[PDB]
RNA sequence: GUGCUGCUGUCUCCCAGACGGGAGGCAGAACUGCACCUUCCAUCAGAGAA
DNA sequence: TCTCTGATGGAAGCATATCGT
DNA sequence: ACGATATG
């Protein structure tokens, strides 16, 4: 399935939900324990601080002894296979319980006819009553039905609960012990601590269901605003929600499977109205405010079988067969790129009017009409000032470092003489003094300078939102990735002047790189909403995308498969098909003629290429997405580069490695 | 609702101390702008910086 | 030596089937 | 037809 998840505000929460919570992590953390327990191996347990004990089998036996097992070790190798049925350690095909909130009742609850029914399993046939299939039962049930006949498999709970919300805290520990126990079980193939939860240290999500996994609710929307109603053994309660513009307007329906569906609006731009249906929902605390989890699903957009099928087609290499398009798909590739946001172009299968002509595999040629550019420059005087004062950060902290080292040795390197004088001292315009005791007094003036212009730089990048510029505001733009540069540099400096005083700090910068990450995600974030956008808007089914997995670079930044995945995500959901293509020597070679040509550095968007023997240029951005989109299209037909090495007489052999040098070296 | 995301006034804590920096609490003022699947866990590494 | 990511994992975000009234 | 478990 697929799911997405949001989270609303309730502030006047009863004490009967509190109670209902804080009881539920308790059970919960007593379930954690009786399984670890009955598992019946010593573990590590980490608690608040991060200290780690080694519970030894006398904690576990006693815990056993005080649960309801007096005699835990005549009946160990039941329990153990139990403990290990409800883990989910037996083979997936003929499960003991296929849901492990399913063993509660024939754990908890007294006289329980569970484990004594055949009516679900798939040897009834009707077209009888006294086929009993009770041979074939699975192990975990029937050490269950075993221990319950020896009359100790009913446990006395810490607190007296109702079962469907056992059953929610069956699930929540059950879950945990199966994500803890495949982490130790991968710990001990190299040759694992326990958390467990808390009320807020390590909260679990308190579920309510509609079909038994704990208890059910009845979820409205009124004006803005949901309502949720959890019926609780003592009561019905109902709650209300702070309004979100996250569902924003919403409007809710039951089903007849039952489940909720929600009509909604997310953005501000449009008016589009999501849909998502709501089957279980989720209870968390966090610095003392309650929060409920939406996680709907959603249906994503329907991907045509063409799409699938031309994928299949271009992504393969030329030494292969594969069925032909035969339809008029259109391909859309772009280069990522931080001074360029990216850059797009696109193309439509059997037609050529006026545009970049690229051959395509085994069809006719097709012109590229619409390409460009988007996002990059806003403004060019905050783009300047946040890269002088990144530079600034970066030979201040080369500076105060140089100074740190001169005041206490009282000499200086040649190497880092010469580098202090030539480099560090104009990057940091700063004059140098030779008294030690007021050359801090300067460096922390210069530092007061820094951070206020840093100020004043952040409170433009604020007040880009909030004048009448407002809709000129590009949705993303070059600024983001310098911001995060220079609020790296800023951090790094600070951090260096706040040690100055050498010859910890429990909080320190957490301001500053809570602010990094929420940049980054937000600009993630825009990023892929606006490729989404470009690619929806020209009606691309298929996205060549440079695959940027082979400073002032996007890999500084972020991980290099991060942004990747992230955009085949959103265009999968989209309805549109992603392939990464390589980008060897895509910047530097003309999509006119395929030919090597001039890529400036002194203006890194111009790209100078020969043809008919006059030198022509052309944007060296554009120029990427058209060689990726020409190297998807074409299959990778014609190569640049050739690895070889040389065995004798002068005559080099080529090295072939990939399939694609293959394919290309038998067409020639 | 979480963020992009700040300003002013005032108060508290911490590190140098007399040039300064970091972390927070309330009260106001301007703003109707853009985007948003998230929760929890364990091991191993990359960074930087004393 | 210490913190903070970051990698790469792991577990999650319900449905049908009867009897009994 | 809806509640109470119980199991794919």
Same mark, same amino acid.
């Given at each position: 399935?697929?799911?997405?998840?949001?989270?609303?505000?309730?502030?006047?929460?009863?004490?009967?939900?509190?109670?209902?919570?804080?009881?539920?992590?308790?059970?919960?953390?007593?379930?954690?324990?009786?399984?670890?327990?009955?598992?019946?191996?010593?573990?590590?347990?980490?608690?608040?601080?991060?200290?780690?004990?080694?519970?030894?089998?006398?904690?576990?036996?006693?815990?056993?002894?005080?649960?309801?097992?007096?005699?835990?070790?005549?009946?160990?190798?039941?329990?153990?296979?139990?403990?290990?049925?409800?883990?989910?350690?037996?083979?997936?095909?003929?499960?003991?319980?296929?849901?492990?909130?399913?063993?509660?009742?024939?754990?908890?609850?007294?006289?329980?006819?569970?484990?004594?029914?055949?009516?679900?399993?798939?040897?009834?046939?009707?077209?009888?009553?006294?086929?009993?299939?009770?041979?074939?039962?699975?192990?975990?049930?029937?050490?269950?039905?075993?221990?319950?006949?020896?009359?100790?498999?009913?446990?006395?709970?810490?607190?007296?609960?109702?079962?469907?919300?056992?059953?929610?805290?069956?699930?929540?520990?059950?879950?945990?012990?199966?994500?803890?126990?495949?982490?130790?079980?991968?710990?001990?193939?190299?040759?694992?601590?326990?958390?467990?939860?808390?009320?807020?240290?390590?909260?679990?999500?308190?579920?309510?269901?509609?079909?038994?996994?704990?208890?059910?609710?009845?979820?409205?929307?009124?004006?803005?605003?949901?309502?949720?109603?959890?019926?609780?053994?003592?009561?019905?309660?109902?709650?209300?929600?702070?309004?979100?513009?996250?569902?924003?307007?919403?409007?809710?329906?039951?089903?007849?499977?039952?489940?909720?569906?929600?009509?909604?609006?997310?953005?501000?731009?449009?008016?589009?109205?999501?849909?998502?249906?709501?089957?279980?929902?989720?209870?968390?605390?966090?610095?003392?405010?309650?929060?409920?989890?939406?996680?709907?699903?959603?249906?994503?957009?329907?991907?045509?079988?063409?799409?699938?099928?031309?994928?299949?087609?271009?992504?393969?290499?030329?030494?292969?067969?594969?069925?032909?398009?035969?339809?008029?798909?259109?391909?859309?590739?772009?280069?990522?790129?931080?001074?360029?946001?990216?850059?797009?172009?696109?193309?439509?299968?059997?037609?050529?009017?006026?545009?970049?002509?690229?051959?395509?595999?085994?069809?006719?040629?097709?012109?590229?009409?619409?390409?460009?550019?988007?996002?990059?420059?806003?403004?060019?005087?905050?783009?300047?000032?946040?890269?002088?004062?990144?530079?600034?950060?970066?030979?201040?902290?080369? !500076?105060? @470092?140089?100074?740190?080292?001169? *005041? +206490? #040795?009282?000499? =200086?390197?040649?190497? $880092?003489?010469?580098?202090?004088?030539?480099?560090?001292?104009?990057?940091?315009?700063?004059?140098?003094?030779?008294?030690?005791?007021?050359?801090?007094?300067?460096?922390?003036?210069?530092?007061?300078?820094?951070?206020?212009?840093?100020?004043?730089?952040?409170?433009?990048? !604020?007040? @880009?939102?909030?004048?009448?510029? *407002? +809709? #000129?505001?590009? =949705?993303?733009?070059? $600024?983001?990735?310098?911001?995060?540069?220079?609020?790296?540099?800023?951090?790094?400096?600070?951090?260096?002047?706040?040690?100055?005083?050498?010859?910890?700090?429990?909080?320190?910068?957490?301001?500053?790189?809570?602010?990094?990450?929420?940049?980054?995600?937000?600009?993630?974030?825009?990023?892929?909403?606006?490729?989404? *956008?470009?690619?929806?808007?020209?009606?691309?089914?298929?996205?060549?995308?440079?695959?940027?997995?082979?400073?002032?670079?996007?890999?500084?930044?972020?991980?290099?498969?991060?942004?990747?995945?992230?955009?085949?995500?959103?265009?999968?959901?989209?309805?549109?098909?992603?392939?990464?293509?390589?980008?060897?020597?895509?910047?530097?070679?003309?999509?006119?003629?395929?030919?090597?040509?001039?890529?400036?550095?002194?203006?890194?968007?111009?790209?100078?290429?020969?043809?008919?023997?006059?030198?022509?240029?052309?944007?060296?951005?554009?120029?990427?997405?058209?060689?990726?989109?020409?190297?998807?299209?074409?299959?990778?037909?014609?190569?640049?580069?050739?690895?070889?090495?040389?065995?004798?007489?002068?005559?080099?052999?080529?090295?072939?490695?990939?399939?694609?040098?293959?394919?290309?070296?038998?067409?020639?």
């Amino acid at each position: 399935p697929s799911y997405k998840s949001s989270r609303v505000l309730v502030r006047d929460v009863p004490e009967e939900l509190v109670d209902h919570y804080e009881r539920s992590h308790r059970v919960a953390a007593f379930f954690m324990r009786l399984l670890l327990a009955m598992r019946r191996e010593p573990y590590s347990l980490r608690m608040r601080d991060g200290t780690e004990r080694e519970v030894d089998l006398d904690e576990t036996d006693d815990f056993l002894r005080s649960a309801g097992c007096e005699e835990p070790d005549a009946v160990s190798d039941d329990l153990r296979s139990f403990a290990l049925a409800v883990l989910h350690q037996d083979n997936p095909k003929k499960r003991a319980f296929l849901e492990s909130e399913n063993c509660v009742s024939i754990l908890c609850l007294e006289k329980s006819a569970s484990g004594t029914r055949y009516y679900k399993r798939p040897g009834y046939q009707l077209l009888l009553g006294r086929e009993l299939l009770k041979t074939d039962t699975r192990e975990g049930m029937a050490a269950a039905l075993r221990l319950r006949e020896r009359g100790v498999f009913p446990v006395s709970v810490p607190e007296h609960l109702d079962l469907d919300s056992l059953k929610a805290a069956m699930a929540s520990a059950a879950e945990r012990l199966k994500s803890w126990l495949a982490c130790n079980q991968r710990a001990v193939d190299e040759k694992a601590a326990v958390t467990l939860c808390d009320a807020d240290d390590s909260p679990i999500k308190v579920r309510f269901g509609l079909t038994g996994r704990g208890r059910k609710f009845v979820l409205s929307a009124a004006g803005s605003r949901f309502l949720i109603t959890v019926k609780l053994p003592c009561g019905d309660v109902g709650l209300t929600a702070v309004p979100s513009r996250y569902f924003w307007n919403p409007s809710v329906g039951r089903t007849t499977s039952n489940s909720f569906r929600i009509e909604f609006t997310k953005r501000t731009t449009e008016n589009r109205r999501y849909v998502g249906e709501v089957k279980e929902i989720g209870l968390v605390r966090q610095r003392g405010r309650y929060y409920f989890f939406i996680d709907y699903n959603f249906d994503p957009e329907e991907v045509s079988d063409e799409t699938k099928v031309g994928r299949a087609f271009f992504r393969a290499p030329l030494n292969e067969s594969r069925p032909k398009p035969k339809d008029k798909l259109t391909v859309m590739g772009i280069d990522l790129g931080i001074n360029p946001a990216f850059a797009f172009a696109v193309c439509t299968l059997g037609e050529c009017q006026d545009g970049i002509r690229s051959p395509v595999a085994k069809m006719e040629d097709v012109s590229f009409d619409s390409t460009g550019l988007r996002g990059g420059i806003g403004s060019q005087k905050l783009h300047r000032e946040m890269h002088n004062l990144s530079d600034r950060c970066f030979y201040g902290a080369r !500076y105060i @470092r140089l100074s740190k080292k001169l *005041r +206490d #040795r009282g000499a =200086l390197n040649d190497i $880092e003489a010469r580098l202090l004088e030539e480099k560090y001292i104009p990057g940091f315009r700063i004059v140098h003094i030779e008294d030690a005791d007021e050359r801090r007094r300067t460096v922390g003036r210069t530092v007061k300078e820094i951070k206020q212009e840093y100020k004043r730089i952040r409170h433009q990048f !604020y007040l @880009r939102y909030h004048t009448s510029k *407002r +809709d #000129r505001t590009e =949705l993303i733009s070059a $600024e983001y990735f310098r911001m995060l540069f220079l609020v790296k540099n800023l951090r790094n400096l600070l951090k260096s002047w706040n040690r100055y005083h050498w010859t910890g700090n429990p909080d320190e910068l957490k301001s500053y790189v809570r602010y990094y990450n929420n940049l980054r995600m937000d600009t993630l974030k825009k990023l892929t909403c606006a490729i989404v *956008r470009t690619a929806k808007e020209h009606g691309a089914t298929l996205v060549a995308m440079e695959n940027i997995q082979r400073e002032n670079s996007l890999l500084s930044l972020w991980a290099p498969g991060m942004v990747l995945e992230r955009v085949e995500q959103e265009l999968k959901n989209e309805g549109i098909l992603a392939w990464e293509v390589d980008p060897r020597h895509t910047s530097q070679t003309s999509c006119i003629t395929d030919e090597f040509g001039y890529r400036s550095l002194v203006a890194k968007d111009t790209f100078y290429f020969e043809q008919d023997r006059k030198i022509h240029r052309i944007d060296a951005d554009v120029n990427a997405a058209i060689n990726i989109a020409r190297r998807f299209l074409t299959r990778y037909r014609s190569l640049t580069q050739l690895w070889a090495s040389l065995l004798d007489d002068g005559r080099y052999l080529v090295n072939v490695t990939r399939q694609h040098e293959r394919a290309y070296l038998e067409l020639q």
